Amino acid sequence: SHMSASRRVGLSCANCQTTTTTLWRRNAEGEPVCNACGLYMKLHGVPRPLAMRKEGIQTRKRK
Ligand SMILES: [Zn+2]
């Protein structure tokens, strides 16, 4: 693995963690995602799976 610096300039995708994209779309919660992650919800409803279906947290979080 390469030493991936946490340098996140110009937001971060609320799924795939990439800070670089052509268009910043919004997911089901309205969070700032990359174009590729936003389209996957238009196709299905869930975003592009990386770290498994773990943090679909439902603990009354309004935001
Ligand atoms: Zn993304």
52 Cα to the center of ligand 1, angstroms: 15
DSSP the chain: ---------S---TTT--S--S-EEE-SS--EEEHHHHHHHHHTSS---SS-S-----SS---
Domain that holds residue 31: 1-63
CA 7 – CA 52 distance, rounded (Å): 24
34 Cα to the center of ligand 1, angstroms: 4
Q: How far is CA 24 from the centre of its chain?
A: 10
Please work out, in degrees rounded to the nearest 5, the angle formed at the alpha carbon of residue 60 by the alpha carbons of 41 and 28. Answer: 15
CATH number of the domain that residue 8 is part of: 3.30.50.10
Contact between 22 and 35 under an 8 Å Cβ cutoff? The reply is: yes
Residue type for position 40: Y
Q: How many domains does the chain have?
A: 1
Q: What technique solved it?
A: NMR
CA 50 – CA 39 distance, rounded (Å): 16
